[PDB]
Amino acid sequence: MVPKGKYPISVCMGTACFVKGADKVVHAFKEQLKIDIGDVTPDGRFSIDTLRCVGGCALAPIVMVGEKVYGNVTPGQVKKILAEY
Numbered sequence: 001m002v003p004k005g006k007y008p009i010s011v012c013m014g015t016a017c018f019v020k021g022a023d024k025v026v027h028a029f030k031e032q033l034k035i036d037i038g039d040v041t042p043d044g045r046f047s048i049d050t051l052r053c054v055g056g057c058a059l060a061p062i063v064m065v066g067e068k069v070y071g072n073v074t075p076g077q078v079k080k081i082l083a084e085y
């Protein structure tokens with residue numbers, strides 16, 4: 001909402017995936033938003049929520065941002081894919 005939500009990003013923080021210590025790496029992402037007043041590059045590129053993701057996906061790498069579907073999640077991919085976000 002404050003972050004526009006151009007790319008509604010779906011990030012798994014579910015029970016199974018979360019236990020693998022993904023939280024700290026997604027935390028990187030959290031700060032990777034780094035925002036402005038709304039988002040990253042005052043827009044609202046990010047609209048992160050779990051709810052879509054955690055849907056039977058993990059045997060591929062999934063990262064969704066809106067109708068964009070990227071790879072900026074948790075395990076290091078964040079920083080580089082942040083240039084993408």
Ligand code: FES
Nearest residue numbers: 012017054055057
């Ligand atoms: S349950 Fe971890 S990826 Fe959609």
